[PDB]
Design an enzyme around this catalytic site. Structure first.
Site, PDB file in Angstrom:
ATOM      1  N   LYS A   1      -3.285 -14.765  15.244  1.00  0.00           N
ATOM      2  CA  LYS A   1      -4.707 -14.655  14.926  1.00  0.00           C
ATOM      3  C   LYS A   1      -5.158 -15.765  13.986  1.00  0.00           C
ATOM      4  CE  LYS A   1      -6.688 -11.896  11.902  1.00  0.00           C
ATOM      5  NZ  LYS A   1      -7.219 -10.709  11.155  1.00  0.00           N
ATOM      6  N   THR A   2      -4.571 -15.780  12.792  1.00  0.00           N
ATOM      7  CA  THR A   2      -4.887 -16.763  11.764  1.00  0.00           C
ATOM      8  C   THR A   2      -4.820 -18.216  12.234  1.00  0.00           C
ATOM      9  OG1 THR A   2      -4.111 -15.255  10.031  1.00  0.00           O
ATOM     10  CG2 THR A   2      -4.287 -17.604   9.464  1.00  0.00           C
TER      11      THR A   2
ATOM     12  N   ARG B   1       0.831  -1.205   0.000  1.00  0.00           N
ATOM     13  CA  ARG B   1       0.000   0.000   0.000  1.00  0.00           C
ATOM     14  C   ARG B   1       0.866   1.255   0.000  1.00  0.00           C
ATOM     15  NH1 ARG B   1      -1.842   0.872   4.451  1.00  0.00           N
ATOM     16  NH2 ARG B   1      -1.224  -0.950   5.690  1.00  0.00           N
TER      17      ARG B   1
ATOM     18  N   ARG C   1       1.618 -12.378  -2.387  1.00  0.00           N
ATOM     19  CA  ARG C   1       0.231 -12.715  -2.070  1.00  0.00           C
ATOM     20  C   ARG C   1      -0.420 -13.648  -3.077  1.00  0.00           C
ATOM     21  NH1 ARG C   1      -0.717  -8.886   2.432  1.00  0.00           N
ATOM     22  NH2 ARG C   1      -2.546 -10.222   2.665  1.00  0.00           N
TER      23      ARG C   1
ATOM     24  N   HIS D   1     -11.793  -5.387  11.879  1.00  0.00           N
ATOM     25  CA  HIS D   1     -10.644  -5.979  11.226  1.00  0.00           C
ATOM     26  C   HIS D   1     -10.347  -7.218  12.075  1.00  0.00           C
ATOM     27  CE1 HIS D   1      -6.170  -5.859  10.031  1.00  0.00           C
ATOM     28  NE2 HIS D   1      -6.888  -6.372   9.049  1.00  0.00           N
TER      29      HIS D   1
ATOM     30  N   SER E   1       0.134  -8.698  13.474  1.00  0.00           N
ATOM     31  CA  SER E   1       1.125  -9.675  13.043  1.00  0.00           C
ATOM     32  C   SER E   1       1.825 -10.274  14.254  1.00  0.00           C
ATOM     33  CB  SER E   1       2.168  -9.014  12.140  1.00  0.00           C
ATOM     34  OG  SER E   1       1.553  -8.409  11.017  1.00  0.00           O
TER      35      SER E   1
ATOM     36  N   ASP F   1     -10.608 -11.744   7.476  1.00  0.00           N
ATOM     37  CA  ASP F   1     -10.061 -10.407   7.611  1.00  0.00           C
ATOM     38  C   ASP F   1     -10.954  -9.207   7.891  1.00  0.00           C
ATOM     39  OD1 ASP F   1      -7.456  -9.055   7.502  1.00  0.00           O
ATOM     40  OD2 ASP F   1      -8.244  -8.104   5.673  1.00  0.00           O
TER      41      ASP F   1
ATOM     42  N   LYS G   1      -8.305  -2.844   0.383  1.00  0.00           N
ATOM     43  CA  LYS G   1      -8.211  -1.924   1.505  1.00  0.00           C
ATOM     44  C   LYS G   1      -8.934  -0.593   1.300  1.00  0.00           C
ATOM     45  CE  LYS G   1      -6.438  -4.689   4.457  1.00  0.00           C
ATOM     46  NZ  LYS G   1      -7.378  -5.242   5.500  1.00  0.00           N
TER      47      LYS G   1
END
EC number: 4.1.1.49
Length: 524
Positions: free
Chosen positions: A249-250, A60, A328, A227, A245, A264, A208
């Protein structure tokens, strides 16, 4: 289907040919057209998926993000230059907007265009209808994967609430005189309801960008915009997981006994929790079939690889991070077996889990939060690394917030209270010395939360932070529940961290909401 005349309403002219909501079959053929060059070029991999390269546009561009300041946003947006700022919401003048818009429409004029109509939000009554216009096939492919694909019936009565025009091929030569950051731009206008992308080829800007817009529109209607990842148990009980990060979480939201709603972006309205997306945009560095079998298996035809290294033969080298570590892959959600189907939504969440990695070694493995503490810690968005370097990301996603952070906290607890949900702070961190918390222990803690065990458990309070810690947890050594047992000593570290929190929170004390919340934070 739509006519050329419809696109001219946006300023585009001389429309050669339009390919409206192309099938995956068509997109595959388009991407492999040998006449494509540069960033438009697509390459077939041994796994069956097409891979593309976005050049130096690896992530981004917060510095190139602008929102038009007008009667619509003037008093509602969380501006980067008013009050206390502290964000990427840089204001843009309406006149410059018309110039940027003109550059994109002119770039798209006289071309064959791809138009993809889709939905953002899985619940029909609260979803947003979005129209995407691009001159590049893989970009149309990216939005097909990431947003909810309408049925032919839904397509019949389609009327877009928001329009995003991707003009990656053009740039703004007058940027300097206009006082902008660079010749690239990611701009939003809430009055005309449009997003423009110029210069940058990073797919995530489309994902995003809409997330930021949902973050503006939904809370205003009293709908939580979050989020987080979300999953459901056999009894239909739903839990939402927040975490930056390294928090895990994942991994922790991946459970064979719990169906995935999404990984997400989610909203929470009168009917329950819903996914904003129709696909997953997963990171692929060091991806192994052994560690992440679900993601690995999702990579096949219809998935779209981005910036990964592919060899002439042998193809994919998921380990090569020489160009970027932000490699990605996007794919439609149905490429994952263990999901909630046919629609990505469920009932109200009854368990809210905030994950953190406290490298300072002060916070307990698990604490049951009070309503005010939930708001305080949601706003703090703490996590630390290397041990220690602290990070505070408001609402666990500061870069996509459009309203004042306190607004998101308020709606969250409003929905939690209506559901009688319970929030927990889970620390999976390590200070770097001695025995660390094991994945097994971490899973035991999550299980205890999910099964309702800690809900009415007896607890003891941790000094300064005033966190309620359960007296004992099945499958876990009672010893590890008290963070002090790992070590003045803890106190000295606790004072350091408490000071950090306090320092950070001052950013929201101006508002009556933030101000009232100070009493829920660390007392030093």
């Amino acid at each position: 289907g739509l006519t050329p005349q419809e696109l001219e309403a946006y300023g585009i002219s001389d429309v050669h040919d339009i390919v409206y909501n192309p099938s995956y079959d068509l997109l595959y053929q388009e991407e492999l057209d040998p006449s494509l060059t540069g960033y438009e070029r697509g390459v077939l991999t041994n796994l069956g998926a097409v891979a593309v390269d976005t050049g130096i546009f690896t992530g981004r561009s917060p510095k190139d993000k602008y929102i038009v300041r007008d009667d619509t946003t003037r008093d509602t947006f969380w501006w980067a230059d008013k009050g206390k700022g502290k964000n990427d919401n840089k204001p843009l003048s309406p006149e410059t907007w018309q110039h940027l818009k003109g550059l994109v429409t002119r770039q798209l004029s006289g071309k064959r265009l791809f138009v993809v109509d889709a939905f953002c939000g899985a619940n029909p009554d609260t979803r947003l209808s979005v129209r995407f216009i691009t001159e590049v096939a893989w970009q149309a492919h990216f939005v097909k994967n990431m947003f909810i694909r309408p049925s032919d019936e839904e397509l019949a009565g389609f009327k877009p609430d928001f329009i995003v025009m991707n003009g990656a091929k053009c740039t703004n030569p007058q940027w300097k005189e206009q006082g902008l950051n660079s010749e690239n731009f990611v701009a939003f206008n809430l009055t005309e309801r449009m997003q423009l992308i110029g210069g940058t080829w990073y797919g995530g800007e489309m994902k995003k960008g809409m997330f930021s817009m949902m973050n503006y529109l939904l809370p205003l209607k009293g709908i939580a915009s979050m989020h987080c990842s979300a999953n459901v148990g056999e009894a239909g009980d739903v839990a939402v997981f927040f975490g930056l990060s390294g928090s895990g979480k994942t991994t922790l939201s991946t459970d064979p006994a719990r169906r995935l709603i999404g990984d997400d972006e989610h909203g929470w309205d009168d009917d329950g929790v819903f996914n904003f997306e129709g696909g997953s945009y997963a990171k692929t560095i060091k991806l192994s079939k052994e560690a992440e079998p679900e993601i690995y298996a999702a990579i096949r035809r219809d998935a779209l690889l981005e910036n990964v290294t592919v060899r002439a033969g042998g193809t994919i080298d998921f380990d090569d991070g020489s160009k970027t570590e932000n490699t990605r892959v996007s794919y439609p959600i149905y490429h994952i077996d263990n999901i909630v189907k046919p629609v990505s939504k469920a009932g109200h969440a009854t368990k809210v889990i905030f994950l953190t990695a406290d490298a300072f070694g002060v916070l307990p493995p698990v604490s049951r939060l009070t309503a005010d503490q939930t708001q305080y810690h949601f706003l703090s968005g703490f996590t630390a690394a290397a041990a220690p370097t602290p990070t505070f990301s408001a609402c666990f996603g500061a870069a996509f917030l459009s309203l004042h952070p306190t607004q998101y906290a308020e709606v969250l607890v409003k929905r939690m209270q209506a559901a009688g949900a319970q929030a927990y702070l889970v620390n999976t961190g390590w200070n770097g010395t001695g025995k660390r918390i094991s994945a097994a222990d971490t899973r035991a803690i999550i299980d205890a939360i999910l099964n309702g065990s800690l809900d009415n458990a007896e607890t003891f309070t941790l000094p300064m932070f005033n966190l309620a810690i359960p007296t004992e947890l099945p499958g876990v050594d009672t010893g590890i529940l008290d963070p002090r047992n790992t070590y003045a000593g803890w106190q000295e570290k606790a004072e350091t961290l408490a000071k950090l929190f306090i320092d950070n929170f001052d950013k929201y004390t101006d508002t009556p909401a933030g101000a009232a919340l100070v009493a829920a934070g660390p007392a030093l």
